[PDB]
RNA sequence: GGCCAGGUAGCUCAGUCGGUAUGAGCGUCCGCCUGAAAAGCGGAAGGUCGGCGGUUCGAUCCCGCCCCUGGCC
């Protein structure tokens, strides 16, 4: 029974492992992964996503802009411009997932972080409907919250989706918890990428990884997810 | 702000006009609003109180008539004669607050300084306080999305409820509900510049109101429940109609207007004193209302004090205007004025109810203030005058909402729902022509119409149908490599962190880098959370070293961290590109122009080590971190990448010059590794002996080797060779030279001795390699292995100057 | 749905062993001739109850493998006999462990679907075939180099192979002394997941090594992966911002007391304040006494909501000392 | 450039790696992976086929 | 935008309106002690008291600005 581990194993980050598990779930359903730059142009982060000219999210209040002023260059407020680059470079149909670092103006406390990771999905094909979106969200929920996981969509609003909806998740390991948003791809976004809206429909969705990992595992302080303390990562095991 | 507050009684009242006897549980109404697309923030009731809570009249203690001649006695708000509400001795105000006590709007849980003063005639002194104040009501706090500006009132939300409950709706802005006041001539001269974005401007005066009159209790109470404090009947009706119909109204002093009113752009440096008594610096892109003297109001934001309705105004000129949403939103955000009118104008206001809402104020003002409505009206509706405010019609298939939803709705569902929200729907075979109402400018495309049918039918009917899985290719080579690198480092004792892209303040000054160092050329953020950390990360080490200090400063002194993330390396000044039109696809030249304007963002892998590399135990005292541990992390990443790397000495801060290796893949530099400089460690507060690694994964090419080894069945020959080289000769260079000379018989070579001493000479060292020779088709003799050994010795003498140990 | 949890774990176990120095082989299901007689197994040993092939390629190898060790040891002999003396091999495959004599099932008519009872009958007639992971080690575990002459393979290396498979499976295992051939009875551990036995590990018996032509000091490990439940833990760590307290406790126990039993007693007595415990000294000097050993553990105490005093940590240390005195008979060194 | 790998890395078998690559190829297309016993009844090995 | 209240050792926090923070607990170091440790006892190291300036022979403590936090808006 003497200790024999001369080199104590480390640990991959739980967010990275959750991202890898989310990726494998969609790879198993025929999707693929795509990456994009974190410093993104305003053309792909707002303009191509049907954001109006005077949208409040385009100001210096919520979006990290790159100096000097009016440079049209910023840290991405979402991984959606990665899907725009895929819609411009790849041939239809497109079933891709984007898991990357996201930047928001919210301060770092026990339940919010300015630097978080989110997963965004994008499916564009002939005859995609809301039922295909809800079925994808449910398969996403079951793989991350157990077989008894079910999603619920309530009408909402997003500039790049129409109709839009927010996703709530039900997991029997705690009720409904606010998970993320979804909706059918707006026809303006398809026209901004050279796609005929009359021939191709599509849906999209987006959830935060730090948010998903918080209420699932019951992690109280989300500052422990990003500060890089060894006591937080080691209990999650070495990794895959 | 996207906040909308109104009580349930006022909302139920407008709905009950068309659907008599309609009344639902506030819990049910919240589920209905949340189901059709309205986010409910909070459902707060009023009060509640019980027992001794009645209304009294004052006659600074004074006798308060609690009713039936039972006077009891008990701050700058009320005087003598004003009806007030008191919690008689033995109070039970929310929550548990137990002479008398003259309550306020905040103490009773009803509104926001002074005490509550009921208007004269609101209630006989002695009536039930909970009944007069209406504490049984429930206030709904809603967060209205920007696409539904028509829901910024009771009119829009009552319409939404009538749609969800399939009710008959009576528009409170209709001419059958608002009798059209006579039009016997102009109300006031008006000039307007058509390039300012005004769509409609209506004016109607009210003459001879009582200055001492106050608004009735039902009007003031509904204002407080919506978050607006009552002032005077002239202003209370302007805010009450705004909350009712959605068209914001502003009252001016008719006698305090000199000359012709004029809607006009502002001037640079022009400052207008608003109603709050504050100077507001204006811009050339702002809309104003001016006359022959000063400025009357800021277009769609807030009125000025020049025409402000005082507490003695008798002649009031009411204003009903429709301003440009972009001009109002651009103006109210510059000077920080999120007024109730500006929030609704930026979300567009129904331009067809301007006169209807105008006549709503005049009749309501003259009724509660004893005024006389003048039969004059000035209604400017553009040039030429616009008499139809309907948006362009939309065409879409009758089954388009069925296809987008994946649900076979009953026939007539799309046409019924679209007419239910106020749109004109005509039939032409299988194509519907839908003209949205004037209060729905968000409906422009068929997708907008699909949302209306889907949200009203409920998104719960949409089934869960997994789409067919396309023939995907899976993870790319680089994505598989990042996983393998993470697995291999974690299994070797490294703990992954999430690095932050914001560099510490003066991190490169602590590293002692030169002024022209490429890593100093960073990308600055205009609005960072910390003003002293605006620069983006050109290297993952500062984020790792920051996390290394955090673990060491908290009792974890034996740390090994790593991170896999991109960096931001600009090649020029921050340069943006012009706006590409969104109505088309950007060409490949414009896409490459967008990529070139962005800084180079390659994905790096980096790692830091400190303290004990191997922990102590029953085997020994452990081994501290040294530079070779950093070099081994390079080999671990290399084996995970299935590429061969070479290490060469290099001088590269912040690494120790004599303990730094530059990693190469073939002939391309991919990063550095080793121990950090002791000066950098001292200035940064790092623990002594800290080692670091950083590689550029984009510079490492993805390999797919296909080995075909042939296991020889013949015995091997074991030989050792000792070679003396100069001290600066890398042991790998000797091994490569021995391998190149030994030939194909050399199956394996391993270094197992590095000896220095006087037997060898100054600045020289002896290296002993273990060699294993094996033939693929025969058994070797000792001379055959010695011949390949002698060739390896001669190859070492010619490449690294090795001398056979004697 | 992608890979199952078992398929995913089998990859992780293979990656971890390969990255730890082990070389994967493909084990042959046919057992060597008289290998159990070389191991000295009893006549009623369950591993002897094998499934035999009627027409094998080699008539002296008809039986199917009840354990993965014979194929690994045969591959171990091949490597060593050809100049590769420092080798660590592993394999992940199934075994054939019948529970009765070879009993067949009659022909089911293929013109219809077999009923669920007939499908269950066909499964019951087949021998049990669980997934096994096993490894063998010989020669130098750590090679020689500029650091030193290397370290030969010892039983602890086989014990560490268990913890590598355990960490890769995200399960907690315990090792207990056991007498189970072909292992050395004094250097053999039985691996448990909770209270279920999943295999053994350690150094092979010296007599088995002589009779089998194996290298001296050969170590081996074999675990039943089916007996290890697939776990999906959801940790929720609470990183305390308050400083820790470092103390060391030296306890004297009998030589037969396992070091993990002392550590388990110290944790049980220390309470929630104990953040970490690690053994770093095993002293058997003459001032300790015959058949007695001294164990020194490094303790790290940390409170989640306050800063501890030295007395607070000492109170937890003393409670840990009493727990060791009660469960393993430890005596405080002095 | 001194040797620093004190733990000689091993290797997963190429056949196992090829099977893993083949499995990932079909899983990326929606397929799943099933397993079975090597000792099989003649009903499932011949008669059912 | 308002007065305030806070930033102090490696960690968590006390305390002074001007010359010593005789700072605490834990963390670090030395000695006695032990085969080596820890505890215990006995000694120590370590802060430029939020930054840039202003007054003063002298500023953690007073003026001004700002950096960042809560509070209450
Ligand atoms: O706060 C937030 N974090 C997020 O990820 C989001 C949730 C999802 N939203 C993105 C999205 C909206 C509609 C369709 C596809 C993606 C952003 N909101
Ligand atoms: Mg819409
Ligand atoms: Na070295
Ligand atoms: Na020389």
Residue numbers in the entry:
A (entry chain D): 98 to 271, 276 to 341
B (entry chain E): -2 to 56, 69 to 83, 87 to 110, 122 to 135, 138 to 831
C (entry chain B): 498 to 831
D (entry chain A): 98 to 146
The authors write:
AaRSs catalyze the attachment of the correct amino acid to its cognate tRNA which then is used in protein synthesis on ribosomes.
The protein-fragment interactions were analyzed using crystal structures for five of those fragments complexed with MtPheRS/tRNAPhe (DDD00107555 (D-555), DDD01008876 (D-876), DDD00805735 (D-735), DDD00079004 (D-004) and DDD00067116 (D-116)). A strong Π-cation interaction between the imidazolidinedione core of D-876 and αArg201 is observed. The carbonyl oxygen of the imidazolidinedione core interacts with αGln215 of MtPheRS through hydrogen bond. In accordance with this, binding of D-876 fragment exhibited highest interaction energy (−93.6 kcal/mol) and ligand efficiency score (5.2). However, the auxiliary pocket in the structures of PheRS with bound fragments was completely unoccupied offering an opportunity for fragment growth by adding hydrophobic substituents to explore the auxiliary pocket of MtPheRS.
